[PDB]
Amino acid sequence: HKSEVAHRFKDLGEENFKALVLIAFAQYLQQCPFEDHVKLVNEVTEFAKTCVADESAENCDKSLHTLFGDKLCTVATLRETYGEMADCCAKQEPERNECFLQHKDDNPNLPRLVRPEVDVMCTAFHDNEETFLKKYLYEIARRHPYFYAPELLFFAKRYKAAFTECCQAADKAACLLPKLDELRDEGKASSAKQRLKCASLQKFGERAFKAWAVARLSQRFPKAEFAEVSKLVTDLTKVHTECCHGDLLECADDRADLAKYICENQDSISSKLKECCEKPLLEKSHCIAEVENDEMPADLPSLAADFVESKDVCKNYAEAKDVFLGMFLYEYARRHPDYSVVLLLRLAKTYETTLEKCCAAADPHECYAKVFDEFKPLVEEPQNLIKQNCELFEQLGEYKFQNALLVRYTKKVPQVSTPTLVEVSRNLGKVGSKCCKHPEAKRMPCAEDYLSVVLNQLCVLHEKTPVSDRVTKCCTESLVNRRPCFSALEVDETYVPKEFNAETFTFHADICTLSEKERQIKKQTALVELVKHKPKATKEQLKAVMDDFAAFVEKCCKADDKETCFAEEGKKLVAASQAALG
């Protein structure tokens, strides 16, 4: 139209508009105080109301970037607090915004956000609901400069909902706490996937990304024509390139147009897009990106017809390699919603290696005639891992299951830091209780989703303070061999056991007076240290000690003079245990 703000204000709503503007400013001016951002918000909202009333009013013709950039340069302490960034204000708009993007500190040094007591939170919420939500919308956004703004809004509303429901509940904490812990994890996971998708698009390039997308989109929209999926994969590539660059406005419009395109062609893509297409602007694309897989056509041919048997396969492949390979993916992915995306990529990659060496020899048709038998071991490997590990988790519980993984991984990379091992294992455990809950049909996709962030988390840490070549190998390998590389790690035969430290195995009464989470972590910590000291301990020998300890604790956290029990009996435990572990 004639006025951008006016238009955005109208099909967004005053409430949503003010929240997004706050997020946007908090993501650039990460150092300014809350009271300051609220003022800017009010000022931009007022200005916006002016344009809604009269599209010809002053400045209402200016573009969003221009308007956004002029207000940013308004801040007086800009140069004194942000330094270089202030020199951005000296350039012509096109470069000005580009300049601002370059200075968006992805990770500032702000104190960790501490969760206050349920009672102080609930009371604050009742006293002033609005500033309570905005204050935290602000604290989160400033710490996560690249989190796509609208999604952050979606999390804000889920937090408001948890307070509404829980602050009225009889037992506040039993209600609110678990919901908040739930929100945090999903929030941190969403943030990790976002950063990951951008990282991958930079390291491995466009082709790899497009392949991941074709597979993913084909499972989702199995009824769509290949030309339709290619079309969407193309736009999705543009969309994420821009969104990764960090330009919110640019990102938002590309996503909007795409969401618009999909809904208008709704019948030619998926039947399950009905709901999502009914929702308002702000929510369309979010919904679509999360929609359930549609049902695959009941009448689908065998892949071997067009990709193995049919002579002249090499003719179609040489005609246009990636297109053909893309069609392979499309066809294979839409018949297998139960496969993880990387598995599909492994299959596609195997096919490529085959067609490459087979199309350059005597009788092609017979060289690549087998290929589908190449897939079997590839498909079964992740499947066996899934059932083996889920069975085990059903036997032991989440906690005792975490302990098993703990012993297994400490033995494979004893060089890693204990607190790192404890965290990684605990998270591997969660993926276990989250995913083993699903029918075998939705398991592999479930693990892939969660395992991808945990493995990326693991790598980043390790990147900071490297400790094992093996870990570095897997972490720098192709994103398709990442998990398989960690799966292939074997017990470290080299490792020289840590020498005994009396303290490391000394326990007091505090452990009795602690919470579940903290008790476990205390126990789990001693367990990693144990294995590092005697890495040759048998699952049996080890289980023997864990049983004595299990009791030992009990005996002392139920005995009169606890101070000495943990000291007299502790002497015994440690001494005996060492005797049994040689």
Ligand X SMILES: CC(=O)C[C@H](c1ccccc1)c1c(O)c2ccccc2oc1=O
User: Which residues, numbered 194-213, are part of the site for ligand X (CB under 6 A)?
Assistant: 213
Question: Restricting to residues 69-108, which ones interact with ligand MYR according to CB under 6 A?
Answer: none
- The binding site consists of 1, 4, 11, 65, 238, 242, 245, 247, 250, 253, 257
For residue 255, what are the CA distances in angstroms to 218, 226, 409, 568? 19, 21, 41, 66
Is 480:345 a contact under the CB 8 Å cutoff? yes
Q: Work out how close the CB of 390 gets to ligand X at its nearest, in angstroms, rounded to a whole number.
A: 24
Query: Phi first, then psi: what are they for 27, rounded to 5°?
Result: -75, -20
Residue 545 contacts which entry, ligand MYR, ligand X, none (Cβ below 5-8 A, type-dependent) = ligand MYR
Q: Work out how close the CB of 360 gets to ligand X at its nearest, in angstroms, rounded to a whole number.
A: 33
Q: Does 459 bind ligand X (CB under 6 A)?
A: no
Distance linking the first and last C-alpha atoms of the chain: 81
Question: Restricting to residues 311-350, which ones interact with ligand MYR according to CB under 6 A?
Answer: 322, 325-326, 329, 340, 342-343, 345, 348-349
Binding map of ligand X across residues 222-261, x = CB under 6 A, - = no contact:
--------------x--x---------------x--xx--
Structural Rg of the chain based on CA atoms: 28
Of the pair 366, 571, the CB lying nearest ligand MYR is at: 571
Cα(210)–Cα(193) distance, rounded to whole angstroms?
17
Of the pair 195, 216, the CB lying nearest ligand X is at: 216
Among 195, 216, 336, 462, binds ligand X (CB under 6 A): 216
Q: Does 27 bind ligand MYR (CB under 6 A)?
A: no
Q: Which stretch binds ligand X (CB under 6 A): 269-277, 283-291, 497-505, 556-564?
A: 283-291
- The binding site for Zn(2+) consists of 65, 245, 247
Choose among 500, 331, 522: nearest CA to 426. Answer: 522
Query: Phi first, then psi: what are they for 392, rounded to 5°?
Result: -45, -50
Is 482:475 a contact under the CB 8 Å cutoff? yes
Q: Work out how close the CB of 291 gets to ligand X at its nearest, in angstroms, rounded to a whole number.
A: 7
Question: Restricting to residues 287-306, which ones interact with ligand X according to CB under 6 A?
Answer: 288-289
Q: Count Cβ atoms within 10 A of the Cβ of residue 432 and give its class: 0-12 exposed, 13-18 middle, 19 or more buried.
A: buried
Binding map of ligand MYR across residues 453-472, x = CB under 6 A, - = no contact:
-----x--------------
Chain-centre distance of CA 465, in angstroms?
22
Question: Restricting to residues 161-220, which ones interact with ligand MYR according to CB under 6 A?
Answer: 180, 184, 204, 207-208, 210-211, 214
Is 544:573 a contact under the CB 8 Å cutoff? no
Chain-centre distance of CA 366, in angstroms?
43
* Helices and strands of the chain, counted as H and E runs: 29, 0
Q: Work out how close the CB of 333 gets to ligand X at its nearest, in angstroms, rounded to a whole number.
A: 11
Q: Work out how close the CB of 382 gets to ligand MYR at its nearest, in angstroms, rounded to a whole number.
A: 4
Q: Which ranges of 171-225 would DSSP assign to H, the alpha helix?
A: 172-203, 205-220
Residue 274 contacts which entry, ligand MYR, ligand X, none (Cβ below 5-8 A, type-dependent) = none
# binding residues, ligand MYR (CB under 6 A): 88
Among 247, 306, 352, 477, binds ligand MYR (CB under 6 A): 352
Give every CB contact of residue 343 below 8 A, 6+ residues apart in sequence. Answer: 378, 379, 382, 444
DSSP assignment letter at 199: H
Q: Work out how close the CB of 241 gets to ligand X at its nearest, in angstroms, rounded to a whole number.
A: 11
DSSP assignment letter at 368: S
Choose among 280, 277, 251, 276: nearest CA to 264. Answer: 277
Task: Please give the residue ranges that form the binding site for ligand X (CB under 6 A).
Answer: 213, 216-217, 236, 239, 255, 258-259, 285, 288-289
